[PDB]
Amino acid sequence: FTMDHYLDIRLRPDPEFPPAQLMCVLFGKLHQALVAQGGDRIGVSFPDLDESRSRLGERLRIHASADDLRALLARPWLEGLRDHLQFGEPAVVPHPTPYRQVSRVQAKSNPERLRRRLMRRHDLSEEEARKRIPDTVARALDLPFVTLRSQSTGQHFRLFIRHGPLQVTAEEGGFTCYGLSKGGFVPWF
RNA sequence: ACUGCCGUAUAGGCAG
Numbered sequence: 745f746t747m748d749h750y751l752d753i754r755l756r757p758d759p760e761f762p763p764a765q766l767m768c769v770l771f772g773k774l775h776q777a778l779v780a781q782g783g784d785r786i787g788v789s790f791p792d793l794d795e796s797r798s799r800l801g802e803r804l805r806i807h808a809s810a811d812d813l814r815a816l817l818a819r820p821w822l823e824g825l826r827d828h829l830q831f832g833e834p835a836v837v838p839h840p841t842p843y844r845q846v847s848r849v850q851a852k853s854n855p856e857r858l859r860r861r862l863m864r865r866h867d868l869s870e871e872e873a874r875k876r877i878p879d880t881v882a883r884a885l886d887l888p889f890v891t892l893r894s895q896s897t898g899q900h901f902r903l904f905i906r907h908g909p910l911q912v913t914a915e916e917g918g919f920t921c922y923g924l925s926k927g928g929f930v931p932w933f
Numbered sequence: 934a935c936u937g938c939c940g941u942a943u944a945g946g947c948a949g
Contacts, residue, residue, distance in 0.1 A: 775949090850947075853934045858943070866941085877943045884934075891934095894949035899935045901949070922949095 745914050747787060747930065749810040751817065752832035755802040763802050766828050768890045770804055775892075775922050777821035784918030786812060787930040789846045790888070793907055798888045800905065806923070807930040810834050841933040842910035845925040849906045851883045907932070 755766045778786055786808040792801025813834035859873035887904040917927025
């Protein structure tokens with residue numbers, strides 16, 4: 745709809761850095777750009793997604809207005825990265841395409857963590873908490889992910905990404921500062 | 934496979 749432009753970024757193979765690491769860094773710098781930019785009008789997708797193998801592939805697509813794309817290309821978030829990437833031209837998307845949400849998915853991967861929260865919210869003990877929240881509560885996602893380092897937290901975390909069911913038409917909605925759906929759809933091709 | 938947040942929640946959502 746309003747996001748009828750896109751830019752493709754393809755990773756260049758490198759002897760010192762495997763593709764997954766270049767992708768994490770690319771995605772992380774995008775996040776930094778999007779925070780600075782502000783707004784909720786820029787989306788991403790991973791056109792070379794390999795769902796069978798939960799791999800994102802070596803392509804990052806930015807979905808936005810033509811102007812944003814030309815700005816994003818000249819901006820410092822890409823510093824140190826440009827030599828590791830190949831860029832397409834900011835372009836109008838093909839048509840027709842299906843649309844899909846590209847979303848962050850989170851999992852209760854750590855029962856102990858849910859327990860510290862529970863204790864804090866019900867003044868419970870560890871033994872009480874463990875009785876109510878067993879270790880089987882743990883869920884593992886079968887999804888591709890990037891590994892990120894937060895600046896505000898200190899943590900390294902995995903950010904799991906799901907490319908949702910193909911839809912014929914898009915619905916109104918925006919995107920987080922990681923370019924992931926908070927309702928918005930992007931064209932898939 | 935981290936830390937936390939919302940929620941009565943172990944349901945389910947969210948932040949970096």
